[PDB]
């Protein structure tokens, strides 16, 4: 395993959560970390993603204006802050790295469930 990530729980619509992915051996200018989500009965896509070299991002048009994604070199960990969350974000969340556009390693997945 290289990634594990962590923050997950229960959420009352409107609020906020914060995820953790801490990423461990193996790191560089040339890799891209990114957070994915599945909903039941749904297929996974990708939320956001970031280059660890330059902080260039990524977010996809569902979340974008209301989800931030940001990277601590010194603690080799990326950050989700999700907020103004609505029921219809209730998935597994999953962080990922990968380098030229591919995603090779894979976290655990965190269950972020959003109740009225």
């Known amino acids: 395993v290289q990634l594990q990530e962590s923050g997950g729980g229960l959420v009352q619509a409107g609020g906020s959560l914060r995820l953790s992915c801490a990423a461990s051996?193996?790191?560089?200018?040339?890799?891209?970390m990114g957070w994915f989500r599945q909903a039941p009965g749904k297929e996974r896509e990708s939320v956001a993603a970031?280059?660890?070299?330059?902080?260039?991002?990524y977010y996809a048009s569902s979340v974008r204006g209301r989800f931030t994604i940001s990277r601590d070199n010194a603690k080799k960990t990326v950050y989700l802050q999700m907020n103004s969350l609505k029921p219809e974000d209730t998935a597994v969340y999953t962080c990922?790295?990968?380098?030229?556009?591919?995603?090779?390693?894979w976290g655990q997945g965190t269950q972020v469930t959003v109740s009225s």
């Open positions: 990922g790295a990968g380098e030229g556009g591919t995603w090779d390693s």
């Open positions: 051996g193996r790191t560089g200018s040339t890799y891209d």
């Open positions: 970031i280059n660890w070299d330059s902080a260039r991002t």
